[PDB]
């Protein structure tokens, strides 16, 4: 492989969710690439530390289609696989109209609601987290 030139982090990484016992991380479209890191980091903390202030983290992924973001499905798979303290509950919301579904969306929908699970993991993705189709119900979720 070729060699790369790296210019170090510019993030200035605010992490105020550690300041709250319960946090709701909402990711939308392209604005969900960082959360992978975040999620992994969080679970790693919950693995090594014991008296953490954030007792429960909710990750509301909202996307039209998971195209170009299928890797995030495997990242979430590993995140929930290593979450031994049930710190993170993930909720995926596909907002694509059913009339415009691609192959992946149709397969995910049927494996979610018209094809039986195996161990509460969808046969297509493999996630205990439930995928929902439509606009996320934010204020009923908050109540």
């Amino acid at each position: 492989y070729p060699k790369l030139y790296l210019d170090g982090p510019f993030g200035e990484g605010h992490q105020e969710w550690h300041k709250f016992e319960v946090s709701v991380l909402v990711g939308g479209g392209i604005g969900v690439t960082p959360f992978a890191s975040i999620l992994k980091d969080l679970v790693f903390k919950s693995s090594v530390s014991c008296q953490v202030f954030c007792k429960k983290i909710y990750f509301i992924w909202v996307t039209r289609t998971q195209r170009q973001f299928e890797w995030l499905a495997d990242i979430i798979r590993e995140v929930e696989e290593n979450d031994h303290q049930d710190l993170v509950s993930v909720h995926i919301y596909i907002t694509q109209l059913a009339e415009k579904f691609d192959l992946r969306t149709t397969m995910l929908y049927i494996c979610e609601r018209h094809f039986q699970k195996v161990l509460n993991r969808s046969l297509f993705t493999g996630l205990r987290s439930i995928t929902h189709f439509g606009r996320p119900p934010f204020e009923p979720f908050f109540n």
Binding site: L103, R104, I110, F115, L123, P136, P137, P140
Partner: protein, 255 residues
């Protein structure tokens, strides 16, 4: 072999490749001595337009570009000699050739709407979702795909548990017909879904061989050893309506 260009659909750029014409197999390779395709002929049709589109019988259509129209004639003559040594030719418009033969974008755009038409009853979406405007749909469902290509079509990696498990249930390649045939049987309404899946024309009558094909698919649902003879005996003793014959706290709820 000789250097030329290969098309990859309306939205993709052409690739400069090389063509080697062996009798048993014609090999299109990359410029880095990397083989891209090796099509073997079993004793297919060709269309000319600068462009030469060979329509594989059960594989992806292959469109090659020529340096010149006379160069197109020379390359076509060489390829025809090599292929006939181990035979239908036609001519159509360039746009007609591009939008007629199976391309990747066109195949995906057809398969998505075909799947939506199939599973409209489950998705609770009206059948007016899109237009599947038959024979080309049958060809698209017939095309068997390698594991990597199929996983790419479904947006998965070649070594994912879902694709590997369905390949194990389907077994070297896989066609979408067998894929969804396994899927629907593993999904009473299954009989209606399978019947409407084999009703390409939409008239509602599986004429002669689609009934036996559906019987064989439902046998592929149920693992057995005497499959063919048992299915034949069942069909003989028995003979849609064919379905009847065969049967004889957190709040997360999206709008």
């Amino acid at each position: 072999g000789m250097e030329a260009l290969e098309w990859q659909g309306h939205k993709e750029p052409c690739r400069p490749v090389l063509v080697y014409l062996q009798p048993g197999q014609i090999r299109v390779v990359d410029g880095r001595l990397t083989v891209l395709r090796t099509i073997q002929l079993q004793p297919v049709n060709f269309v000319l337009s600068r462009t030469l589109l060979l329509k594989i019988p059960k594989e992806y259509d292959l469109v090659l570009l020529f340096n010149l129209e006379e160069e197109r004639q020379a390359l076509v003559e060489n390829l025809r000699g090599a292929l006939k040594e181990s035979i239908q030719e036609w001519e159509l418009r360039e746009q007609e050739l591009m939008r007629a033969a199976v391309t990747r974008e066109q195949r995906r755009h057809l398969l998505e709407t075909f799947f939506r038409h199939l599973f409209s009853q489950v998705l609770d979406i009206n059948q007016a979702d899109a237009g599947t405007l038959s024979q080309k749909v049958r060809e698209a469902l017939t095309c068997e795909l390698s594991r990597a290509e199929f996983a790419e079509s479904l947006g998965l990696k070649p070594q994912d548990m879902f694709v590997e498990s369905m390949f194990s249930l389907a077994d070297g390649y896989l066609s979408f017909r067998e894929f969804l045939d396994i899927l629907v049987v593993f999904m009473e309404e299954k009989s209606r879904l399978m019947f409407r899946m084999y009703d390409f024309d939409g008239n509602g009558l599986i004429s002669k061989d689609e009934f036996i094909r559906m019987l064989r698919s439902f046998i592929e649902i149920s693992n057995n050893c005497l499959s063919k003879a048992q299915l034949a005996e069942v069909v003989e003793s028995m003979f849609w309506e064919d379905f009847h014959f065969m049967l004889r706290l957190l709040f997360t709820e999206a709008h």
